Every structure is written in structure tokens, then in C-alpha cells.
Design a protein around this ligand. Structure first.
Ligand SMILES: [Zn+2]
Ligand SMILES: [Zn+2]
Ligand SMILES: [Zn+2]
Lengths: 364, 147, 213, 194, 111, 50, 155, 42
């Protein structure tokens, strides 16, 4: 079909009688020539293309960086390339080194930085520990009066069990970063500890964001409760997306007269994989979201999207360093791994389990 | 000497050693008191070199809370003597003497092998645990194996 | 507040359920598909602003064309569950509810998890076919995604013609698994060949088949 | 001109170190202070080498044999003229630079916490002039790295190729376009899609 | 900050005096009992600070491996001192310096 | 350290003895073992005196 | 009637803690008590009480009898705005810090005009070198176009 | 005689002409260091 679009694209009338200026005999000779050559340029039945593909991929490998580096002077940016990556591809290793989601946006958000920062904040995960500044245990006996002269006006402005105090101070920069408030957190704590932990909190415009806690020998228990509090309380976030990167893109889009021109649009490149949750978030173009742990892509989108993704990975890996393979080889390789229903990596476990001859498998 | 307690992982941040001709990671307070320094002022006196290091002291607490059940010498001596392979039936009487000649000879032999000097070895172990807890809390780089 | 996100999730799930019930050959009128949100809040939530799942169930009859091309197609029953951790109780009574009207296929949407002892209560509802789905799965329609191409299930004969053109046996085709989201989106059974029309950058349009198990 | 372009680059370095030591340096996203600092220095020095190398390359006349062997594209390229006429440049070890084997210093011939260009590998001459001992030592280190990596990866790639070939060696093109394996699992219905 | 017994030299664990409503540090090996002057029993600081730490600096003036500067000392106004960058270095630690005067032997900075 | 150093430079102690001072954590180590790889060097008179 | 007396007492005191106005103060809280009538209500009180006795800011209790607008402090949604000034400057300072740490790094690299791209044919290209081949064969140069993003390698 | 574990503690000059820092500008002979941060060595 593409070839018919080519022939119909070239030999139209004005581009024959007003640019090439052929006659008749030459025209006939040309059509005959096209037929002859196209009939000469076909594949030949009896052509072991599998070996040619395994070689034509096995050959640009033997001259590629075995440590690559680059972004090596940056610890916030990790990436696996060259050999180790190809080895982590042909093995379908269920644990890679740099998991990274690539999340797009809708048009209204794509170019308004503020909304993009809102959606940027909505995804990132955060426990209660990620905002704590100090944890302090006190023996403050009076249930309705305190020794900490700071919290005096709180308790004396609060009344209009156990005698031990669990008091902690937070950090404002991250309570403003995640756009949280004091209440919402207090609600989280009261919900997670039922009725055992009597909770007390202070206003936003204080000078220290303080949380006071009591329970209804009484010391070690409060330590265990404390570590549990810091370790197991989430305030938002898709659990498993510990970093988000705001990234720019320059894409090509047609104009109004049908001409492709560039265009600057924002996008997200995040650390950690969790597709089944990030797909379902308002503001996210759920149709374009793409990852690179194609095991999950298999567990979510089927076998075909997994084929396309795997091809895209190999194409990126080989194409990073100037080398250029022709396509039917890589398409064959990616259409051998996924042609039984699941990923069949190339080692010995994935192969040995087939139904081929015993000699063909013992000779390996 | 092995320091357990992964950064906020593995529950207890306890220290457990390893001896020649034994079976299990024997704790550290048990070898201190097993050498004959049963109080705690002497132990935390040997290990740390300051009374303001409440950070290392903060990490030390689980070691004494772990070595509380043993309070005197003989029960720790035989606590070690029972694990050290040997035969099986060298009870208190002979087995204590087994663990004793174990903690004279194999343990730190380059220091000495004559009795009446175990203080020396206790000082040395103090320096060792000190250096470990100087490396763990990140005050000095890890050793390079190719210097 | 937190109300609108739950309501939005339930809404998207219901819409995806309807589109799924539309690509399988049945009949859904456009007054039902193009439901906006005020109709959903007004017709599903209580005066408290909280849902009633028992007011979201419905029945579906097949169209004439799909009735002609695919012969073994009865009716469809769609019911959202009520309890959260679906155990033996709701599963048994639901199985009786399908065994009562003698209908042919039911969809039992759960919420969080199903007990295994009740997960044995699926080969006990024959000759009908009960098909379970989680709700947090159907929030996104996987078919509008870029990569996933069109999957079109074939009829009985056309399959025989396809096996005559290549001279094959049903086991020598590229396979798809019974639990693979675009294989239950269409509701496949052992022996049904889906056709795929993939794009290609060496000939534009490439048609490739694939069988199930 | 070349020696001056390096002098300003070197002088510039003295400025970045000053800022980093008075806490007046912008922190780059995703990076600690010291990573951003190291990244900055490297950009400045690599620019200098290229700027100096570009200068020497453009002076050359129209019969300097090397311009004929490189201009013909048969053997060599720009980095050779640059490393023979201008500055040898930077030395790298695992992407980062000459670490401190000794405690807080590279070689015992330098002070502690010294981080000028020549204190951590930046070679400053060209092979026609000569090499100071420290620079020669660092260069030998880098070359040793190269020989080691070369000694490592080749066998890895060979075994990888053996796995690929032993995996794909029975896929044929039968007399009607099908690309079946040894027993009929149609891999591709029409070879190469076309 | 914790204390020790005086009749056993073992550490004192915090014990509660239920009746008088007060805190004590009581030995678990003996019968010693001491009053508690401070209400706090346990502190666990998560996020920390400090980009300082000049570390041990005894006889650091004659150390030939350290660089020297013409910085004037705030104490004796001498313009000849040794300088260093920090000790105990986290990955996030500042690159600011510590100067040590060769005349008055005082550690000073640059603010 | 000075007295021991001169008692080495006089020949009383075998010249291949290591007198190493870590002024940092305050450790004075002396090495007299077998296998240490070493090399000679000139000497610069650093003493602030003459 | 617990709150009917307590809301008053607490309001009276924390509004005196900062002559005849007694009825204007009482009229205001009595309207504010039935205003919250519009356990989640109790949480609304703690907001009003706290911002008042957060002393430090006399303006609030001191600037609450002069004039002000009253029904605003109800559907306020200005918890960031309602006192005090220094804090507002911080929440505007912290925000910029949070917006900066949410982004990512980029790339540096030197560019030279000694190479040409095969795609867009631009002379902006960075490079680096590794030893891909043996010890007898020359180095392998990796080039990258700093315009379209194309990459290639050298023999 | 100095060995390896001692070499950490010392401080070396490369050439004798360096023991007394000088009071040039040539393209043939190479560029020797400067010791940028050391106005006085020992
Ligand atoms: Zn005692
Ligand atoms: Zn001074
Ligand atoms: Zn290009």
C-alpha cells in the first residue's frame, strides 16, 4: 500500500507533462522496467533469516560501551545503557535498575506551569515521616494542663487515660509542598489509631507545627507506637512513585495549512513504576501513558502493546550510539519472544521448556 | 564482629560476634562479662571514650538490654561453653574449663596466651567496638581493600 | 471533596462496563451511553450523597446483526455487588439469582477481594457463564490506549476458511491467554480466534490473527 | 591565543571554587551541591579544550599533511590535531575523576583538599611539548582503565551472541510467505510484512 | 543523657511513682532510687543539620600537608593560618572552610 | 616522635622501621614487620632552628 | 447548652485577653455559634479560637473591634491569609523551594562544529570516547546531535 | 627509607629546583604546576 502511494505520488500528470516531459515509448519502457525490477526484488523461499537476524543484532553489540557512564556525575539521574541494559532485556529480568514512568498531560495543563505543578504534587508518595522534624516523649501528668509552656495556650484553649505525652514538631516547607493542612493529618492519625490515641493539634499560624498525643509502666509502648506512626502513615500519593521530574518536550504538530511545525509542551518523567494507578488520575492523558518495565505492560495491556514496547526498547538501545539496524531483524526477534502467550526470555529456562527435539535442546 | 540492624530495618540494632570453634553469633556483653567485667560502668567505660557521645550511647542501649539476663561470670562462661562444639555432655564442671581455655588461646592469640592478662584483651575489644561504632554512624570512611 | 472522586470512579467504571457491553454485540441506546454526571448523582446517590449499587444493575438483549453473525449469544445480566470482601454468602445467592431466570452470562463486579472457597462457586452455575471483574480495574478503558490495536472475534466458518487457506491445525497459531485484559474485554473461550489489524511502517496495514486457549 | 583561552578558563575555575566555598552557588535539581559543582567545572574545562583545539585546527595551512589525511576522511579526525597541537585535556575514571587514594588528596606532592585543575587530572600540555610526572601517571591510569574494559566486554558480547544464534536457527521462509519454525508455529504470516 | 546506679554501677531505667505523681530513675539490678530532674526520657531526632565539624585540631598547625592562607585572625589579627573544608562529610555537606591561626592557635571561620 | 626519629637516623635502630603518627585520631603506630615495600628518599631539613 | 455557655466564655476571655461593647461581642459570637450550626462543627471553633490567642499578632484581636468585616471569617478559605505577615512570606518562600525540587536535571556537554548530523544537518554536536574494541584497534567515538537528538558512533 | 603506610603522613617536593620557589614563558618546555592554594610550603 505504501508503494502504491509512492507510485501514485510520483507519476501524476503535471509532474509528467510539465517536469519530466516524457513521451510514449519511454513511458511504456518505464512501466515495464518497474514491473521487472519489483519482480526481481522479492525474498527467496529457503532463506534462514533467523540466523541472519541473530547475527545482525549480535554484531553491533561487540563494539559498545560496557559501563557507558554519562550522567555519571549526577546521582539524582540514574540510567542503564549499553551492555547491562541489553542483558537486562534479553533476560526479562523482573527487577531492573532504573524504573521510570513517562506520563503525559492534557492540553490545558501541558502549557500552564501551575496546574502542571498541582498534578506534579498529586502523584508523589509521602509518609508521615517525610515531614517530621523532631520527636519528643514527656512525663506531663495533668490531663488538662501542660508543663511545655508553648502548648499552654492550646490546652487552655481546647477545653471550652495515661499520663504520658508524645509530642512531635513538623516542618512547614513540606506541609506546604504537598498542600496539606493540620486537620487532614489529624484525621489521618485518628482514623488509623481508632480511639486509643487521643490527638491534639495546633493552628497553622503558630510558630511551631506541634502534635500532642496520649493513650487511654507506660513508656516503651509509646516508643513502639511512635516508630509505627512514622513508618506506616501515608498522607497521599501513588504508593511506589518516590520521585517526579518536570520535563520539557518539543513535538511536531501540523498547522492550519497542513504544515508540520514544532511546539513546546511539558510532560512528566517519574521514578518508580505503578501504571494501574497513574493511568487513573484526573489530568492525565490515560491513553498515552507509557513505561519501560514491559512485564507490567504485559500484565496490564496484553501481548501486542508488549511487543511494540519491547521493539521500542531495543530500537532505543541500538540507536543510542549511531549504529543503525534494518527492521525485519528486530521485528523477528521481538516476534519470537512473544509468540506463545507470555514473555519467553533467551537463556535456558525459557527455551528448554519448548516441544522441540531432544537433540536440539541437548546440543545447547 | 557483625553489626545487625539495617537502617530502620531488621528490628534490633544489636551487635553479634563470632569465635573460633563455636556455632552461633554470640553477643558482646556476654563476652565482656565472660572475661570478668560484670558491671556496666566498666563496659561503657571501655567502649566509648567520652561521656558526651550520647549518639553512640544511644545505639548502645539495646546491647545492655540484650545482656541483662546474665549478671555474673559463670553462667556466661558456660553460656559460651555449651555452643563451642566439643563433645556433647561436658556439663558445667568440665565445660566451663573448656570455654575458659577457649577464651585464653584462640581468641586474639597475637596478644598473649598467658593467664592474668585478660584485661589487655578487654581493652583491645573496647578499641575494636569503638572503631566499628565510629564507622557505622558515618564519622570516618570505610576501609579501602586495595590500599 | 472526597465525595466527587469516589462518584467519578464509579461513573467511569459504569461507562467502561457499558462500552464493554457494546463491543461484545449487544444493544445499548444512546440515552444510556451519553449519560452526563448530574443524572448519575441524581439517580444513583441517596439523599446523603451515597450510592446504591442495587440501582445500577440491568439486562441486555442482542442486536439482529450480531445475532446473525454470532449464533451462540443469549442475553446479558450486569449487577454490581454490595458487600466489600465478597465471600461465600453473596456469591451463593447471586448464583441462585442467575440460576433462577435462566440467563446465559452474568457479570459480578466485586470491590476488594473474593474468597477462594467462593471462587470454587463458578463451575456450579452451569450451563450459564459467570465472569468476575474488579472495579478498580475498569476505571480506564484499555482500548483507547495508543498501542492496543483492534481485536475482532471471528465466527465459526470463517475460521474454517482461514484454516483452509494456510492448511493448519488449531494449535499452530500465535496464542493469547485466557486471562489477558484484551482477551476478557471481548470474553473469549477456548477455540476462538481473534483477528488483529496492526499498523506497520513497511506496508502500512498488516493483518495478523491470534488464537486463544 | 590558546594559552590565554585556557588561562581564563582556569581563572574561571578559581571563581567557581570560591562560590562553592562561600555558599553562593545555585543548587541544580535532583543533585546535591557537590555534584552540581563537579558538573560545572567539567563543562568549563571541556569547553576550553574544544575552544583551544578549534583554534589550532583553524590556523593550519593548506599543506599540513595531517589536514590532508584527515580532510580525506581516511584516517583520524579532529581530536588528534587537538591533542597534538593544543591541550591534552581531561582524564576520567568511571565518569568521575582522579579520586583520593590517599586521605583527602590525590598524590603526596599536593596539599590537602586541593582542587585546582592539575590537582585532579587536568593535563595542560600537548604531546609535542611534554608531560610532567603527575600528568603522565594519571594518563597511565586512564589507559589502564581502557585496557581493562576492553578485556572485559568482548567475551560477554560473544556469549550473548551464542545465546541469540542458538535461539534463532530454524526459522525458514516456506514456499508461500509463512515464516514457520521447525514445527509450524507461524511466527510471521508474511515475511517482513511486505 | 542517662545515669547509673551508685551501688551497682549499672544504668538507671525510668520508673514511675504512681502515688506522688513523679518520675524516678531506679536501678533494676539493685534497690537504688533517684529523682528525675528532667521530664524527658527518650529523644529520637530524624532529620538533622550541621555542616560544621572541624573535628580534632590538636597540633594541626604544623601539619605540612595542610594549605595555608593570608587570612587575618579575628583574635590576634595575624595574617598566617592553615585552612580545611570540614570533617564527617555527608553527601549534602557545604564546601565552606575552617581556618586555624598559627599564632594564637584559634579556630575561626569566615562570616 | 622526634627522639625516636633521630634514634632511627643515627643507625641505632634498623633503618627500615616505620614510625607513623596519625595526628588525627591520635595514634602512634610503629611497624617492624616483614614484607613492607619501601623506597629511599632525600631529606629536607624542616626544623625551624638553623 | 454546654457549648452555648462555653463558646461564649472562651470567646469573651480570648477577646478580652488581647466597657459596654459586651452586647456587641455577645451578639457577634451568638451569631457565630448559630453560624457554625450550618462533630465537624467543633473543628471549626478551634480555627477561630487559635488564630485569636496566637498572640504575637495584636492586630487580629486588636483589629477585630475597630471595624473588620465579620461574616468573612466563616467561608474564609484564607487560612494562609488570616495572620500573620511573616508566615505569609515563608509560605511564599517555601513554595518556590517546593516548586524547584519537584523538577529534574538536564544536560551540559560541549558542542563543536567539526561534525554534521545525518538528519537535520546541523553542526551542534557533543561527544565522548570509550574503548569498545580491542587494544590494537582505535577508540570509539560516540556523537550526539544537540538539536534533533540523533546519535551515531565512529570506527 | 620510606614505605607505603608512612607515605600518607609526609609531604614531598618533586624536584630540587622546587625546594626554593623561583623569583620564562616558553612554548617548547612544558607547563609546570603552580600550587595555587599555597603561598608558603614546608
Ligand atoms: Zn545497682
Ligand atoms: Zn590568631
Ligand atoms: Zn540531526
Amino acid at each position: 500500500s505504501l508503494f502504491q502511494c509512492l507510485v501514485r505520488a510520483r507519476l501524476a500528470t503535471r509532474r509528467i507533462l510539465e517536469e519530466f516531459r516524457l513521451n510514449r515509448d519511454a513511458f511504456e519502457w518505464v512501466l515495464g522496467t518497474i514491473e521487472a525490477q519489483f519482480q526481481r526484488s522479492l525474498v527467496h523461499p529457503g532463506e534462514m533469516v533467523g540466523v541472519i537476524a541473530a547475527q545482525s543484532i549480535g554484531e553491533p553489540a561487540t563494539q559498545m560501551t560496557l559501563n557507558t557512564f554519562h550522567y555519571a556525575g549526577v546521582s539524582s539521574k540514574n540510567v542503564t545503557l549499553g551492555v547491562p541494559r541489553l542483558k537486562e532485556i534479553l533476560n526479562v529480568a523482573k527487577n531492573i535498575k532504573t524504573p521510570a514512568l513517562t506520563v503525559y498531560l492534557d492540553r490545558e495543563i501541558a502549557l500552564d506551569i501551575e496546574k502542571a505543578k498541582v498534578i506534579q504534587s498529586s502523584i508523589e508518595y509521602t509518609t508521615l515521616k517525610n515531614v517530621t522534624s523532631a520527636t519528643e516523649i514527656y512525663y506531663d501528668p495533668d490531663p488538662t494542663s501542660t508543663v511545655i509552656e508553648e502548648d499552654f495556650d492550646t490546652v487552655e484553649a481546647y477545653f471550652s487515660q495515661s499520663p504520658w505525652l508524645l509530642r512531635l514538631e513538623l516542618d512547614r516547607a513540606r506541609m506546604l509542598d504537598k498542600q496539606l493542612t493540620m486537620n487532614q493529618v489529624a484525621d489521618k492519625i485518628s482514623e488509623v489509631f481508632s480511639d486509643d490515641l487521643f490527638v491534639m493539634w495546633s493552628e497553622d499560624n503558630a510558630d511551631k507545627l506541634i502534635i500532642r498525643c496520649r493513650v487511654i509502666e507506660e513508656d516503651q509502648m509509646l516508643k513502639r507506637i511512635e516508630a509505627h506512626m512514622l513508618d506506616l502513615i501515608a498522607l497521599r500519593g501513588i504508593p511506589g512513585i518516590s520521585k517526579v521530574y518536570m520535563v520539557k518536550h518539543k513535538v511536531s504538530v501540523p498547522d492550519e495549512s497542513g504544515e508540520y511545525k514544532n511546539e513546546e509542551l511539558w510532560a512528566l518523567e517519574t521514578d518508580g513504576i505503578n501504571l494501574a494507578e497513574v493511568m487513573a488520575v484526573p489530568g492525565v492523558d490515560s491513553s498515552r501513558t507509557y513505561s519501560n518495565s514491559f512485564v507490567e505492560i504485559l500484565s496490564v495491556l496484553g501481548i501486542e502493546a508488549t511487543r511494540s514496547s519491547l521493539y521500542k526498547e531495543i530500537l532505543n538501545v541500538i540507536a543510542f550510539d549511531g549504529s543503525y539496524v534494518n527492521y525485519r531483524h528486530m521485528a523477528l526477534l521481538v516476534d519470537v519472544m512473544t509468540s506463545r502467550g507470555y514473555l519467553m526470555a533467551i537463556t535456558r529456562h525459557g527455551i528448554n521448556r519448548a516441544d522441540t527435539g531432544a537433540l536440539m535442546r541437548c546440543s545447547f | 564482629i557483625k553489626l545487625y540492624g539495617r537502617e530502620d530495618k531488621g528490628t534490633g540494632r544489636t551487635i553479634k560476634a563470632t569465635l573460633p570453634y563455636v556455632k552461633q553469633d554470640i553477643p558482646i556483653v556476654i563476652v565482656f562479662r565472660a572475661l570478668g567485667v560484670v558491671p556496666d560502668g566498666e563496659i561503657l567505660q571501655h567502649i566509648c571514650y567520652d561521656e558526651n557521645d550520647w549518639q553512640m550511647l544511644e545505639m548502645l542501649k539495646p546491647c545492655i538490654e540484650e545482656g541483662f539476663v546474665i549478671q555474673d561470670k559463670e553462667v556466661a562462661l558456660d553460656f559460651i561453653g555449651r555452643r563451642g562444639s566439643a563433645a556433647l555432655g561436658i556439663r558445667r564442671e568440665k565445660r566451663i574449663q573448656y570455654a575458659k581455655d577457649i577464651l585464653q588461646k584462640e581468641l586474639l592469640p597475637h596478644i598473649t596466651q598467658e593467664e592474668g592478662f585478660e584485661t589487655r584483651k578487654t581493652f583491645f575489644l573496647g578499641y575494636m567496638v569503638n572503631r566499628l561504632l565510629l564507622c557505622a554512624l558515618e564519622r570516618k570512611d570505610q576501609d579501602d581493600r586495595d590500599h | 471533596e472526597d465525595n466527587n472522586r469516589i462518584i467519578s470512579r464509579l461513573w467511569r467504571s459504569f461507562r467502561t462496563v457499558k462500552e464493554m457491553a457494546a463491543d461484545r454485540g449487544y444493544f445499548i441506546s444512546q440515552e444510556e451511553m451519553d449519560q452526563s454526571l448530574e443524572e448519575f448523582r441524581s439517580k444513583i446517590c441517596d439523599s446523603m450523597g451515597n450510592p446504591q449499587r442495587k440501582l445500577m444493575s440491568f439486562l441486555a438483549n442482542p442486536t439482529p446483526e450480531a445475532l446473525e453473525k454470532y449464533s451462540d449469544l443469549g442475553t446479558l445480566w450486569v449487577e454490581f455487588c454490595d458487600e466489600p470482601s465478597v465471600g461465600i454468602k453473596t456469591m451463593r445467592n447471586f448464583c441462585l439469582r442467575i440460576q433462577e431466570k435462566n440467563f446465559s452470562t452474568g457479570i459480578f463486579i466485586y470491590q476488594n477481594n473474593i474468597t477462594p472457597s467462593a471462587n470454587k462457586m463458578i463451575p456450579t452455575v452451569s450451563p450459564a457463564i459467570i465472569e468476575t471483574f474488579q472495579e478498580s480495574d475498569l476505571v480506564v478503558n484499555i482500548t483507547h490506549h495508543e498501542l492496543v490495536p483492534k481485536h475482532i472475534r471471528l465466527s465459526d466458518g470463517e475460521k474454517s476458511q482461514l484454516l483452509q487457506r494456510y492448511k493448519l491445525k488449531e494449535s499452530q497459531l500465535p496464542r493469547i491467554q485466557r486471562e489477558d485484559p484484551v482477551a476478557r474485554y471481548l470474553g473469549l473461550k477456548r477455540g476462538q480466534v481473534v483477528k488483529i489489524i496492526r499498523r506497520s511502517e513497511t506496508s502500512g496495514r498488516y493483518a495478523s490473527y491470534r488464537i486463544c486457549l | 591565543e590558546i594559552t590565554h583561552a585556557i588561562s581564563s578558563a582556569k581563572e574561571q575555575v578559581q571563581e567557581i571554587i570560591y562560590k562553592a566555598q562561600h555558599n553562593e552557588l545555585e543548587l541544580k535539581p535532583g543533585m546535591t551541591l557537590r555534584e552540581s559543582f563537579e558538573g560545572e567545572v567539567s563543562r568549563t574545562l571541556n569547553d576550553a579544550r574544544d575552544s583551544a583545539g578549534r583554534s589550532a585546527e583553524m590556523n593550519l595551512k593548506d599543506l599540513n599533511n595531517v589536514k590532508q589525511m584527515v580532510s580525506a576522511g581516511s584516517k583520524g579526525s579532529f581530536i588528534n590535531i587537538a591533542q597534538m597541537s593544543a591541550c591534552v585535556g581531561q582524564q576520567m575514571v568511571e565518569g568521575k575523576r582522579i579520586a583520593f587514594g590517599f586521605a583527602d588528596r590525590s598524590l603526596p606532592h599536593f596539599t590537602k583538599d586541593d582542587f585546582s585543575p592539575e590537582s585532579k587530572g587536568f593535563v595542560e600540555n600537548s604531546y609535542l611539548r611534554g608531560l610532567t610526572p603527575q600528568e603522565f601517571f594519571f594518563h597511565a591510569m586512564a589507559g589502564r582503565e581502557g585496557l581493562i574494559d576492553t578485556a572485559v566486554k568482548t567475551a560477554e558480547t560473544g556469549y550473548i551472541q551464542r545465546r541469540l544464534v542458538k535461539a534463532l536457527e530454524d526459522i525458514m521462509v516456506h514456499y508461500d510467505g509463512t515464516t514457520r519454525n521447525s514445527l509450524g508455529d507461524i511466527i510471521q504470516f508474511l515475511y517482513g510484512e511486505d | 543523657s542517662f545515669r547509673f546506679c551508685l551501688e551497682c554501677n549499672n544504668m538507671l531505667y525510668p520508673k514511675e511513682d504512681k502515688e506522688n505523681q513523679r518520675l524516678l530513675y531506679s536501678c533494676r539490678n539493685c534497690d537504688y532510687t533517684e529523682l528525675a530532674e528532667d521530664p524527658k526520657v527518650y529523644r529520637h531526632e530524624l532529620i538533622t543539620n550541621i555542616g560544621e565539624t572541624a573535628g580534632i585540631v590538636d597540633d594541626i598547625g604544623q601539619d605540612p600537608t595542610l594549605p595555608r592562607s593570608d587570612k587575618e585572625c579575628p583574635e590576634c589579627h595575624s595574617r598566617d593560618c592553615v585552612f580545611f573544608q570540614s570533617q564527617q562529610r555527608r553527601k549534602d555537606t557545604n564546601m565552606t572552610l575552617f581556618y586555624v591561626c598559627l599564632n594564637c592557635k584559634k579556630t575561626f571561620r569566615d562570616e | 616522635v622526634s627522639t625516636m626519629r633521630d634514634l632511627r637516623r643515627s643507625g641505632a635502630i634498623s633503618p627500615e622501621v616505620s614510625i607513623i603518627r596519625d595526628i588525627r585520631e591520635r595514634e602512634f603506630k610503629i611497624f617492624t614487620d616483614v614484607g613492607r615495600v619501601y623506597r629511599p628518599l632525600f631529606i629536607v631539613e624542616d626544623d625551624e632552628s638553623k | 447548652n454546654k457549648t452555648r455557655n462555653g463558646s461564649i466564655s472562651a470567646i469573651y476571655t480570648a477577646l478580652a485577653m488581647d466597657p459596654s461593647k459586651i452586647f456587641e461581642l455577645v451578639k457577634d459570637i451568638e451569631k457565630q455559634c448559630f453560624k457554625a450550626v450550618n462533630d465537624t462543627y467543633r473543628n471549626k471553633l478551634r480555627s477561630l479560637i487559635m488564630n485569636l490567642k496566637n498572640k504575637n499578632n495584636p492586630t487580629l484581636r486588636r483589629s477585630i473591634l475597630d471595624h473588620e468585616i465579620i461574616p468573612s471569617k466563616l467561608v474564609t478559605m484564607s487560612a494562609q491569609e488570616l495572620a500573620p505577615d511573616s508566615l505569609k512570606k515563608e509560605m511564599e518562600e517555601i513554595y518556590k523551594k517546593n516548586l524547584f525540587d519537584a523538577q529534574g536535571a538536564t544536560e551540559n556537554n560541549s558542542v563543536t562544529d567539526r561534525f554534521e548530523c545525518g538528519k537535520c544537518k546541523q553542526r551542534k554536536v557533543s561527544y565522548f570516547q570509550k574503548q569498545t574494541r580491542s587494544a590494537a584497534a582505535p577508540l570509539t567515538t560516540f556523537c550526539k546531535c544537540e538539536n534533533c537528538g540523533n546519535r551515531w558512533k565512529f570506527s | 627509607y620510606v614505605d607505603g603506610e608512612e607515605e600518607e603522613t609526609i609531604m614531598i617536593a618533586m624536584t630540587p629546583e622546587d625546594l626554593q620557589t623561583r623569583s620564562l614563558n616558553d612554548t617548547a618546555k612544558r607547563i609546570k604546576p603552580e600550587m595555587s592554594t599555597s603561598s608558603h610550603h614546608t
